[PDB]
Amino acid sequence: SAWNTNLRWRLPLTCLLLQVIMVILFGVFVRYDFENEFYYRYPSFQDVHVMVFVGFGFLMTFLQRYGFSAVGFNFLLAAFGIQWALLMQGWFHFLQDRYIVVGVENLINADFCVASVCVAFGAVLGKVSPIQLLIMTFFQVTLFAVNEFILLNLLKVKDAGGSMTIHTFGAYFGLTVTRILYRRNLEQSKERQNSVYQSDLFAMIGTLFLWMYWPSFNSAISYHGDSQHRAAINTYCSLAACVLTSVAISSALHKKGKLDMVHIQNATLAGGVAVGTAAEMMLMPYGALIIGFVCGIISTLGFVYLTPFLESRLHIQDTCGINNLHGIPGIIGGIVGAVTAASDWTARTQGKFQIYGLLVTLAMALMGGIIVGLILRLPFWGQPSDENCFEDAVYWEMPEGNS
Amino acid sequence: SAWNTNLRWRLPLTCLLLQVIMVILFGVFVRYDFENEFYYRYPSFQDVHVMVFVGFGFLMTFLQRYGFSAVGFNFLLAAFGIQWALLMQGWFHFLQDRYIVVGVENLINADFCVASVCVAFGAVLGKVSPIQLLIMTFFQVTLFAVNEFILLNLLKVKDAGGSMTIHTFGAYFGLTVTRILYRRNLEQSKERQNSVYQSDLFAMIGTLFLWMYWPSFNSAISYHGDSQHRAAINTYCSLAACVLTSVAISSALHKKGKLDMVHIQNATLAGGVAVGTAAEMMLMPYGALIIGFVCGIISTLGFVYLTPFLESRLHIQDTCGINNLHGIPGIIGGIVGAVTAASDWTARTQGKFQIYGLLVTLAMALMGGIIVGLILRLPFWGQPSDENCFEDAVYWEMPEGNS
Amino acid sequence: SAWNTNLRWRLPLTCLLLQVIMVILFGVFVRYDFENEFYYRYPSFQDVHVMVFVGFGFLMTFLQRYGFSAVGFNFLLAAFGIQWALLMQGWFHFLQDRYIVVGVENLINADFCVASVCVAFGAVLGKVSPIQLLIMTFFQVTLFAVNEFILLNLLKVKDAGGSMTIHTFGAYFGLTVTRILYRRNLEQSKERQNSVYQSDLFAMIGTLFLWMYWPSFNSAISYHGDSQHRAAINTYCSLAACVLTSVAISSALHKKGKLDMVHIQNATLAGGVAVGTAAEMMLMPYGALIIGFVCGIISTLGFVYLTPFLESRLHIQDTCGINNLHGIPGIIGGIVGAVTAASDWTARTQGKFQIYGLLVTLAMALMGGIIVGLILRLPFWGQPSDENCFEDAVYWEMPEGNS
Ligand SMILES: CCCCCCCCO[C@@H]1O[C@H](CO)[C@@H](O)[C@H](O)[C@H]1O
Ligand SMILES: CCCCCCCCO[C@@H]1O[C@H](CO)[C@@H](O)[C@H](O)[C@H]1O
Ligand SMILES: CCCCCCCCO[C@@H]1O[C@H](CO)[C@@H](O)[C@H](O)[C@H]1O
């Protein structure tokens, strides 16, 4: 029944089937080799790992009665996704036409891949079952891997910090999915689509770990040590500038000049997304400050004006405002990456192909999102009703100390 | 008086005596030497350090009115324990028959030793005074050091991630202690032996830092870089698989298919414990996925069925269900370590001695737990009454903003 | 109007002006170079980065209705401060009489500089607007840079962990500022100048990340690997001993022997501050244990007896008791640094100049604090009234789920 949110058969079936398949496929394909890349790369892996599980995980706990599902479903989707990503990204790097040799570099890329699903989760947060999220993860990891392969291998595009492959891709995939999953009577749940004091403090845990570790995120897969150092510092600068302009615009747009925690939790991160592609390329930090400057402003304007417009007029219900953080700043990051790439004819042509990568990313996000959206819209997955969204009690036993 | 929980003389006396003794013993024995092991090992130290103080610390804050004592007593017991561990573990490595030369490697092992006490704390949490915890730490660190010496030095057993030396040892020591400390009327406090919404979110801080950093935990003291890399990735895999099966079984065992935060906070960590010994030995990741697969299932079944049975029929009151996370998966880890070790005659004999190490660990945990249990049962230490357990107000001034 | 806390023009103006100036000055002066210092130093940078944004940020969230402003204003002041510090500290290291070449070492020092402002923020927390904090940061970063230059370059003083340059300087600057900003009717807000249960748990996030990462804080800029290793372990020891004596004295001073979370959150950190200067110099760990031993006691006595006395008799309103953590232990750290430095004539003279550095730091903190205090006291900045302190609602839109 379409009203049945009882997942006692379906969720275990989905989890166990997926995990058995992971076991079989690891047995067939995945192997180990027999100073280290471990020592020089593991620290970057850990920072990205924290951003996925604690950064995105707690960021989404701002919802007053959706904290368990935010951190807990993120935990679940990412635990599955990292395994499936190792395989999908792996298959584009077979050794002996049949082995995926895994090292720390594979783990780093698997977490980046999953980060795109954490982005998409932000659009549909509160309105989808954990079964829908696992199905989304299954298809989105595949699509991410194919898009990444087209960009990095076929088009020879550079995108170290994933403004295109992670943020633009994840955002517009997520937003396409959420549009297909449009809920006409979502206002029936709107009393829970907000924060309470304590949930905004938990969410700042997420914000701060993303913001602090983003310089590793953007530098982890830069190749030369020289560009890695530059990627990190440019990201650090862009993020710093983003905080001041996000705060400035949050205040400016409020009638009493008061700040809004949605802006401080989310718009302050836009400078990280926007230098994903360019951070490793920019020879001077002042440009990174400008990117952070502009994107804090644009992100905050997006939350205030664009989100309500897109929901009202275009039927895009975007719980975490991922369009304002990952989407628009992702596209900006892609464009700035192209311009920075172009700065002889070989430079000019690199610039054009960076743009090709952006357009390919968007096409894949749209087409992929339509397909996955339509699958997720089927009434089989235990999704809640329009008046039961943003409510943990639908999928969790609620604490005994409360009830 | 046995009803007197006023620690104004006894707690300061205990803290100051212990710390003065640490000062004297450091003065006599502890010295420094006069790329670096600092650079290559300090990062692993920090990850383990976080798991001890923030991981276990916040994990135990799920108790609705025991958050201060959970994080705060963990802080206190570990601050003492790391110092005493440096000495106890140190004495088994005298230089010049009388000096303990400390480097980062000593700090790593001291934190591992204390992790075993954090495990044991999980069984007695809410029912013991901070004085009892310091006394427990004093004796348990000593017992840990002797057990570790027997296993690693005398039996030449391998246990990089401590499935035996930390988890099995800590769990069955803790459970033996809690059995001796059995409280006939504990149901009088049962209204506080649970979570509220916000305490389950704080506890997820603990869960996630343990889960994310466990790959360092299991690889920190692996010797070759080759096995270290393998230890980390096998742990990462086992933990991933553990989340999916823990979630599957939590749902399956609920009448409405709903998830339980006790399972998501604790059973999701069982795959880390279970590959402690084998992670560095397993040449293929698919085996690690299987270990995580099985242990998520077993851990969750333990929480639902074994914990109530052991409390009902065997009088084992296990606050954090450490038997389900550290105990059974610890023994499994020890057994899988033996089988993996055995996979010529030298391999076969290594296998048998791994099993000897498991049996020795259990014997030490039982005998040590009986002795320490009986000391802790003495009415001198300011332990609370059966109707005043899981209540911070017994040992803390409660916030002025509330009262 | 002096009663006008509406920052809709003033806060955006302040943020945008400051950030545009940062952009211009980075464009003129700041450049990049064209194994790595990145690899060996970035990890230490990250630990310090976490201490600034999450450590100090969450530490100050103990205030029951000031959690947003504590973590959020810290975020804002530090985001500005790191940029301005890169410039101010940079100008004392021009290349080509006009370029600041930034690497990871610059980022580490910029975060240390900002840490001093996080300290000062602790005195004025709850009673100053975000505009006052940005103005304070602007001047305090400049003063920090000049004081650091006098000490390190002109006086050839050693202070790796900043007992003088960060803690003593920050504390007495902050306390001078707060004295000039004395509020006669602050008791009108005293119902919010306290914690609730959940705010004390958030604050422990801050406490624990400071405590765990402090060994990196104190070793990050030690030059030789030998002294770095020593700085870290001495800090680890001092902090451990500090917890036991802080707990002992918290209990001893309570009529019922109960612990106070103010002491466990703050006094437990005093051993880190007190070995800032000496940690890299002390050849034996037992001395570090003694410093932590004494400073836990002194810090806790300060919270109980000195804070109320200084507020009552000397009109020093110190929200976070920074005198007890950063001030007195900072001066102790400076004194122990001198004695440790002195332990031939060249050693003796180093000792005297360490003391000169302490006296210069205090003079700069006082003079600088008077000037900045008087500027901040002007009624232009949107500071709240005496009955509206420690209240987020003054500067933030409050969560919709509550209102
Ligand atoms: C969001 C759009 C803002 C405009 C982009 C910021 C300016 C680009 O930054 C550029 O960095 C280069 C480093 O390679 C410098 O050579 C250029 O002078 C600088 O303009
Ligand atoms: C919890 C018990 C589950 C059974 C143990 C998991 C299977 C052991 O994993 C083993 O790893 C080895 C790597 O050295 C491989 O060679 C073996 O093929 C594989 O079975
Ligand atoms: C807070 C004041 C407490 C007194 C200071 C602690 C003692 C100083 O510690 C000193 O460390 C030296 C290492 O260089 C040792 O040589 C000395 O024996 C030891 O006393």
mmCIF file of N, CA and C in Angstrom, chain A residues 40 47 64 194-198 200-202 205 208-209 211-213 215-216 228-230 232-234 236 240-241 243-245 248 251-252 254-259 261 264 283-286 289-290 293, chain C residues 6-8 12 15 19 26-27 30-32 34-35 38-39 42 45-46 49-50 53-54 58 64-68 71 75 79-80 82-83 103-104 107 111 202 392-399 401-402:
data_model
loop_
_atom_site.group_PDB
_atom_site.id
_atom_site.type_symbol
_atom_site.label_atom_id
_atom_site.label_comp_id
_atom_site.label_asym_id
_atom_site.label_seq_id
_atom_site.Cartn_x
_atom_site.Cartn_y
_atom_site.Cartn_z
ATOM 1 N N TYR A 40 51.442 9.757 2.777
ATOM 2 C CA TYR A 40 51.265 11.081 2.206
ATOM 3 C C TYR A 40 49.812 11.395 1.853
ATOM 4 N N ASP A 47 40.325 13.643 6.258
ATOM 5 C CA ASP A 47 39.644 14.926 6.264
ATOM 6 C C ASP A 47 38.396 14.865 5.398
ATOM 7 N N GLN A 64 14.228 20.238 13.030
ATOM 8 C CA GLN A 64 13.920 20.033 14.452
ATOM 9 C C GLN A 64 13.503 18.609 14.846
ATOM 10 N N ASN A 194 11.774 23.341 9.684
ATOM 11 C CA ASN A 194 12.426 24.448 10.362
ATOM 12 C C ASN A 194 13.303 23.884 11.486
ATOM 13 N N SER A 195 14.009 24.771 12.176
ATOM 14 C CA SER A 195 14.922 24.398 13.246
ATOM 15 C C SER A 195 14.345 24.778 14.609
ATOM 16 N N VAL A 196 14.948 24.233 15.656
ATOM 17 C CA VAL A 196 14.816 24.790 17.000
ATOM 18 C C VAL A 196 16.238 25.162 17.407
ATOM 19 N N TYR A 197 16.368 25.872 18.519
ATOM 20 C CA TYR A 197 17.643 26.424 18.980
ATOM 21 C C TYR A 197 18.768 25.387 18.948
ATOM 22 N N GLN A 198 18.495 24.242 19.561
ATOM 23 C CA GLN A 198 19.493 23.194 19.756
ATOM 24 C C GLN A 198 19.849 22.482 18.448
ATOM 25 N N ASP A 200 20.010 23.905 15.553
ATOM 26 C CA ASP A 200 20.901 24.824 14.817
ATOM 27 C C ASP A 200 22.333 24.760 15.352
ATOM 28 N N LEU A 201 22.486 24.479 16.641
ATOM 29 C CA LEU A 201 23.817 24.263 17.212
ATOM 30 C C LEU A 201 24.443 22.927 16.749
ATOM 31 N N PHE A 202 23.650 21.861 16.696
ATOM 32 C CA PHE A 202 24.140 20.591 16.133
ATOM 33 C C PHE A 202 24.568 20.779 14.667
ATOM 34 N N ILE A 205 28.022 22.064 13.971
ATOM 35 C CA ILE A 205 29.076 21.047 14.012
ATOM 36 C C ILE A 205 29.398 20.665 12.570
ATOM 37 N N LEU A 208 31.056 23.692 10.560
ATOM 38 C CA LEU A 208 32.439 23.982 10.901
ATOM 39 C C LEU A 208 33.408 22.883 10.418
ATOM 40 N N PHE A 209 33.011 21.621 10.483
ATOM 41 C CA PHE A 209 33.935 20.576 10.000
ATOM 42 C C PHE A 209 34.093 20.610 8.472
ATOM 43 N N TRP A 211 33.860 23.483 6.716
ATOM 44 C CA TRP A 211 34.565 24.715 6.448
ATOM 45 C C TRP A 211 36.056 24.548 6.762
ATOM 46 N N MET A 212 36.365 23.969 7.913
ATOM 47 C CA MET A 212 37.762 23.759 8.345
ATOM 48 C C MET A 212 38.545 22.767 7.473
ATOM 49 N N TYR A 213 37.879 21.712 7.022
ATOM 50 C CA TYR A 213 38.541 20.658 6.268
ATOM 51 C C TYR A 213 38.437 20.819 4.742
ATOM 52 N N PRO A 215 39.809 22.937 2.727
ATOM 53 C CA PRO A 215 41.100 23.062 2.043
ATOM 54 C C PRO A 215 41.760 21.723 1.687
ATOM 55 N N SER A 216 41.543 20.679 2.491
ATOM 56 C CA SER A 216 41.996 19.315 2.116
ATOM 57 C C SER A 216 41.156 18.742 0.988
ATOM 58 N N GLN A 228 49.007 21.482 -4.868
ATOM 59 C CA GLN A 228 48.290 21.033 -3.667
ATOM 60 C C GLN A 228 48.297 22.114 -2.565
ATOM 61 N N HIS A 229 49.495 22.622 -2.292
ATOM 62 C CA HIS A 229 49.740 23.749 -1.395
ATOM 63 C C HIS A 229 48.886 24.965 -1.799
ATOM 64 N N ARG A 230 48.843 25.242 -3.096
ATOM 65 C CA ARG A 230 48.091 26.359 -3.650
ATOM 66 C C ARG A 230 46.580 26.115 -3.556
ATOM 67 N N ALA A 232 45.004 24.358 -1.344
ATOM 68 C CA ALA A 232 44.625 24.487 0.067
ATOM 69 C C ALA A 232 44.500 25.943 0.484
ATOM 70 N N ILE A 233 45.498 26.758 0.151
ATOM 71 C CA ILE A 233 45.508 28.136 0.625
ATOM 72 C C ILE A 233 44.446 28.972 -0.094
ATOM 73 N N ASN A 234 44.264 28.743 -1.389
ATOM 74 C CA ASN A 234 43.214 29.443 -2.146
ATOM 75 C C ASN A 234 41.823 29.121 -1.589
ATOM 76 N N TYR A 236 41.178 28.133 1.601
ATOM 77 C CA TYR A 236 41.197 28.823 2.898
ATOM 78 C C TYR A 236 40.827 30.290 2.760
ATOM 79 N N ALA A 240 37.211 32.204 3.844
ATOM 80 C CA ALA A 240 37.282 33.311 4.784
ATOM 81 C C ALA A 240 36.453 34.486 4.281
ATOM 82 N N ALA A 241 36.611 34.822 3.001
ATOM 83 C CA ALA A 241 35.921 35.961 2.413
ATOM 84 C C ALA A 241 34.426 35.703 2.335
ATOM 85 N N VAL A 243 32.568 33.997 4.436
ATOM 86 C CA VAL A 243 31.927 34.227 5.734
ATOM 87 C C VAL A 243 31.540 35.699 5.912
ATOM 88 N N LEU A 244 32.441 36.624 5.567
ATOM 89 C CA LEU A 244 32.167 38.037 5.798
ATOM 90 C C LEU A 244 31.041 38.565 4.914
ATOM 91 N N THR A 245 30.981 38.120 3.661
ATOM 92 C CA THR A 245 29.939 38.593 2.762
ATOM 93 C C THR A 245 28.618 37.873 2.986
ATOM 94 N N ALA A 248 27.309 39.709 5.940
ATOM 95 C CA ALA A 248 26.895 41.039 5.501
ATOM 96 C C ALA A 248 25.526 40.997 4.828
ATOM 97 N N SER A 251 22.443 39.932 7.144
ATOM 98 C CA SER A 251 22.019 41.113 7.921
ATOM 99 C C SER A 251 21.275 42.129 7.060
ATOM 100 N N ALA A 252 21.850 42.445 5.897
ATOM 101 C CA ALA A 252 21.307 43.465 4.992
ATOM 102 C C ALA A 252 19.886 43.139 4.553
ATOM 103 N N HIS A 254 17.668 41.377 6.233
ATOM 104 C CA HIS A 254 16.742 41.268 7.350
ATOM 105 C C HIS A 254 16.281 42.675 7.755
ATOM 106 N N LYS A 255 14.987 42.823 8.013
ATOM 107 C CA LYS A 255 14.408 44.135 8.364
ATOM 108 C C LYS A 255 15.006 44.746 9.625
ATOM 109 N N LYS A 256 15.418 43.895 10.555
ATOM 110 C CA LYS A 256 16.033 44.336 11.807
ATOM 111 C C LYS A 256 17.545 44.119 11.827
ATOM 112 N N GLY A 257 18.112 43.750 10.677
ATOM 113 C CA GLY A 257 19.549 43.530 10.542
ATOM 114 C C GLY A 257 20.045 42.248 11.188
ATOM 115 N N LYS A 258 19.119 41.371 11.574
ATOM 116 C CA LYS A 258 19.474 40.167 12.307
ATOM 117 C C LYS A 258 19.955 39.076 11.358
ATOM 118 N N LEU A 259 20.871 38.256 11.862
ATOM 119 C CA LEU A 259 21.427 37.147 11.111
ATOM 120 C C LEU A 259 20.523 35.929 11.150
ATOM 121 N N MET A 261 20.580 31.711 10.851
ATOM 122 C CA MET A 261 21.449 30.544 10.943
ATOM 123 C C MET A 261 21.480 29.681 9.684
ATOM 124 N N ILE A 264 24.383 31.303 7.860
ATOM 125 C CA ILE A 264 25.678 31.061 8.515
ATOM 126 C C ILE A 264 26.100 29.593 8.430
ATOM 127 N N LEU A 283 47.205 31.362 -9.564
ATOM 128 C CA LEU A 283 48.552 31.719 -9.116
ATOM 129 C C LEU A 283 48.596 32.815 -8.046
ATOM 130 N N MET A 284 47.467 33.476 -7.790
ATOM 131 C CA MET A 284 47.409 34.548 -6.792
ATOM 132 C C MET A 284 46.189 34.432 -5.895
ATOM 133 N N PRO A 285 46.372 34.621 -4.573
ATOM 134 C CA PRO A 285 45.250 34.458 -3.641
ATOM 135 C C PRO A 285 44.146 35.516 -3.723
ATOM 136 N N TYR A 286 44.451 36.720 -4.203
ATOM 137 C CA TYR A 286 43.437 37.775 -4.204
ATOM 138 C C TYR A 286 42.217 37.373 -5.055
ATOM 139 N N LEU A 289 39.918 35.291 -2.903
ATOM 140 C CA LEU A 289 39.128 36.178 -2.048
ATOM 141 C C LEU A 289 37.934 36.763 -2.805
ATOM 142 N N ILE A 290 38.148 37.165 -4.051
ATOM 143 C CA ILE A 290 37.058 37.702 -4.856
ATOM 144 C C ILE A 290 35.966 36.654 -5.111
ATOM 145 N N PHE A 293 34.112 36.239 -2.006
ATOM 146 C CA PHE A 293 33.368 37.479 -1.786
ATOM 147 C C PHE A 293 32.025 37.419 -2.511
ATOM 148 N N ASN C 6 19.847 47.615 15.882
ATOM 149 C CA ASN C 6 19.542 47.250 14.495
ATOM 150 C C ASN C 6 20.762 47.491 13.599
ATOM 151 N N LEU C 7 21.394 46.394 13.175
ATOM 152 C CA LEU C 7 22.685 46.448 12.478
ATOM 153 C C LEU C 7 22.564 46.330 10.962
ATOM 154 N N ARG C 8 21.360 46.541 10.428
ATOM 155 C CA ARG C 8 21.090 46.309 9.011
ATOM 156 C C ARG C 8 21.950 47.144 8.046
ATOM 157 N N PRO C 12 26.646 45.126 7.662
ATOM 158 C CA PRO C 12 27.070 44.905 6.279
ATOM 159 C C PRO C 12 28.177 45.860 5.829
ATOM 160 N N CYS C 15 31.476 44.662 7.404
ATOM 161 C CA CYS C 15 31.954 43.405 6.805
ATOM 162 C C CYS C 15 32.476 43.625 5.382
ATOM 163 N N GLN C 19 36.394 43.466 4.085
ATOM 164 C CA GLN C 19 36.708 42.440 3.100
ATOM 165 C C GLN C 19 37.238 43.022 1.775
ATOM 166 N N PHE C 26 45.618 42.054 -0.445
ATOM 167 C CA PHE C 26 46.125 40.780 -0.958
ATOM 168 C C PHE C 26 46.626 40.949 -2.400
ATOM 169 N N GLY C 27 45.874 41.673 -3.225
ATOM 170 C CA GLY C 27 46.283 41.941 -4.607
ATOM 171 C C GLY C 27 47.635 42.631 -4.716
ATOM 172 N N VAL C 30 50.295 40.010 -1.559
ATOM 173 C CA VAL C 30 50.366 38.588 -1.239
ATOM 174 C C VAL C 30 50.585 37.716 -2.468
ATOM 175 N N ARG C 31 51.557 36.812 -2.372
ATOM 176 C CA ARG C 31 51.968 35.976 -3.506
ATOM 177 C C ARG C 31 52.300 34.556 -3.052
ATOM 178 N N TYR C 32 52.405 33.650 -4.021
ATOM 179 C CA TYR C 32 52.851 32.276 -3.801
ATOM 180 C C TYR C 32 54.221 32.025 -4.448
ATOM 181 N N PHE C 34 56.782 29.850 -6.776
ATOM 182 C CA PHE C 34 56.678 29.063 -8.010
ATOM 183 C C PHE C 34 58.064 28.613 -8.475
ATOM 184 N N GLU C 35 60.750 16.712 1.932
ATOM 185 C CA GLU C 35 59.708 17.077 0.979
ATOM 186 C C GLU C 35 59.079 18.423 1.352
ATOM 187 N N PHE C 38 54.358 21.833 3.102
ATOM 188 C CA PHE C 38 52.944 21.459 3.150
ATOM 189 C C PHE C 38 52.776 20.143 3.904
ATOM 190 N N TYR C 39 53.409 19.088 3.403
ATOM 191 C CA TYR C 39 53.228 17.755 3.970
ATOM 192 C C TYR C 39 53.584 17.649 5.448
ATOM 193 N N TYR C 42 51.212 21.027 7.300
ATOM 194 C CA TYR C 42 49.767 21.142 7.130
ATOM 195 C C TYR C 42 48.978 20.433 8.255
ATOM 196 N N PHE C 45 48.857 22.640 11.160
ATOM 197 C CA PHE C 45 47.956 23.738 10.820
ATOM 198 C C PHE C 45 46.498 23.353 11.088
ATOM 199 N N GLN C 46 46.085 22.190 10.598
ATOM 200 C CA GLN C 46 44.706 21.744 10.735
ATOM 201 C C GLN C 46 44.260 21.607 12.193
ATOM 202 N N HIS C 49 43.771 25.019 13.474
ATOM 203 C CA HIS C 49 42.558 25.499 12.802
ATOM 204 C C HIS C 49 41.276 24.999 13.522
ATOM 205 N N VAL C 50 41.269 23.726 13.891
ATOM 206 C CA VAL C 50 40.162 23.132 14.637
ATOM 207 C C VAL C 50 40.025 23.763 16.025
ATOM 208 N N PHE C 53 38.308 27.370 15.515
ATOM 209 C CA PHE C 53 36.932 27.455 15.008
ATOM 210 C C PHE C 53 35.950 26.560 15.767
ATOM 211 N N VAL C 54 36.380 25.353 16.118
ATOM 212 C CA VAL C 54 35.543 24.451 16.903
ATOM 213 C C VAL C 54 35.867 24.480 18.396
ATOM 214 N N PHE C 58 32.959 26.377 20.281
ATOM 215 C CA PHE C 58 31.986 25.642 21.104
ATOM 216 C C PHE C 58 32.209 25.807 22.596
ATOM 217 N N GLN C 64 23.437 29.758 28.005
ATOM 218 C CA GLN C 64 22.170 29.116 27.630
ATOM 219 C C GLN C 64 21.422 29.756 26.451
ATOM 220 N N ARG C 65 21.519 31.083 26.304
ATOM 221 C CA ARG C 65 20.846 31.802 25.223
ATOM 222 C C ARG C 65 21.826 32.613 24.358
ATOM 223 N N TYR C 66 23.111 32.261 24.424
ATOM 224 C CA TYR C 66 24.128 32.919 23.612
ATOM 225 C C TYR C 66 24.935 31.952 22.731
ATOM 226 N N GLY C 67 24.374 30.781 22.454
ATOM 227 C CA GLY C 67 25.088 29.769 21.667
ATOM 228 C C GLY C 67 25.346 30.193 20.228
ATOM 229 N N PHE C 68 24.371 30.843 19.583
ATOM 230 C CA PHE C 68 24.533 31.281 18.190
ATOM 231 C C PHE C 68 25.662 32.314 18.062
ATOM 232 N N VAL C 71 29.440 30.697 18.956
ATOM 233 C CA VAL C 71 30.045 29.961 17.833
ATOM 234 C C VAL C 71 30.059 30.797 16.552
ATOM 235 N N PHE C 75 33.279 32.515 14.650
ATOM 236 C CA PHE C 75 33.423 32.157 13.243
ATOM 237 C C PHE C 75 33.714 33.419 12.422
ATOM 238 N N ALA C 79 37.336 34.450 10.776
ATOM 239 C CA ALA C 79 37.369 34.488 9.305
ATOM 240 C C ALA C 79 37.980 35.800 8.807
ATOM 241 N N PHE C 80 37.650 36.906 9.468
ATOM 242 C CA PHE C 80 38.283 38.180 9.155
ATOM 243 C C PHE C 80 39.735 38.190 9.624
ATOM 244 N N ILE C 82 42.036 35.882 10.346
ATOM 245 C CA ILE C 82 43.082 35.105 9.672
ATOM 246 C C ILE C 82 43.626 35.849 8.445
ATOM 247 N N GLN C 83 42.753 36.536 7.709
ATOM 248 C CA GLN C 83 43.174 37.309 6.530
ATOM 249 C C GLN C 83 44.061 38.493 6.919
ATOM 250 N N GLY C 103 52.942 30.580 2.647
ATOM 251 C CA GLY C 103 52.857 29.128 2.648
ATOM 252 C C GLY C 103 52.079 28.689 3.873
ATOM 253 N N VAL C 104 52.104 27.389 4.146
ATOM 254 C CA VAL C 104 51.393 26.816 5.280
ATOM 255 C C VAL C 104 51.853 27.421 6.604
ATOM 256 N N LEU C 107 49.848 30.358 7.430
ATOM 257 C CA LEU C 107 48.500 30.023 7.890
ATOM 258 C C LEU C 107 48.518 29.632 9.372
ATOM 259 N N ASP C 111 46.472 31.689 12.377
ATOM 260 C CA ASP C 111 45.541 31.058 13.328
ATOM 261 C C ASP C 111 45.968 31.265 14.798
ATOM 262 N N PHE C 202 27.339 20.863 24.764
ATOM 263 C CA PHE C 202 27.919 21.498 23.567
ATOM 264 C C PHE C 202 29.297 22.102 23.889
ATOM 265 N N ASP C 392 20.932 35.946 22.360
ATOM 266 C CA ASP C 392 21.085 35.851 20.899
ATOM 267 C C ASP C 392 20.030 36.635 20.120
ATOM 268 N N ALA C 393 18.806 36.695 20.652
ATOM 269 C CA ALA C 393 17.672 37.335 19.947
ATOM 270 C C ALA C 393 17.973 38.772 19.549
ATOM 271 N N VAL C 394 18.907 39.414 20.244
ATOM 272 C CA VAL C 394 19.320 40.769 19.887
ATOM 273 C C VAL C 394 19.932 40.832 18.478
ATOM 274 N N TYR C 395 20.687 39.809 18.085
ATOM 275 C CA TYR C 395 21.393 39.842 16.791
ATOM 276 C C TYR C 395 20.981 38.739 15.806
ATOM 277 N N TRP C 396 20.163 37.784 16.247
ATOM 278 C CA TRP C 396 19.755 36.667 15.395
ATOM 279 C C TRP C 396 18.235 36.523 15.308
ATOM 280 N N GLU C 397 17.746 36.166 14.127
ATOM 281 C CA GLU C 397 16.390 35.657 13.969
ATOM 282 C C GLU C 397 16.306 34.326 14.709
ATOM 283 N N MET C 398 15.373 34.198 15.645
ATOM 284 C CA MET C 398 15.305 32.991 16.457
ATOM 285 C C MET C 398 14.500 31.887 15.753
ATOM 286 N N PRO C 399 14.889 30.616 15.946
ATOM 287 C CA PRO C 399 14.311 29.496 15.198
ATOM 288 C C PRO C 399 12.789 29.486 15.151
ATOM 289 N N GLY C 401 10.826 26.942 14.769
ATOM 290 C CA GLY C 401 10.305 25.817 15.549
ATOM 291 C C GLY C 401 10.064 26.157 17.012
ATOM 292 N N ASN C 402 10.738 27.191 17.508
ATOM 293 C CA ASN C 402 10.505 27.688 18.864
ATOM 294 C C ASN C 402 9.417 28.763 18.881
#
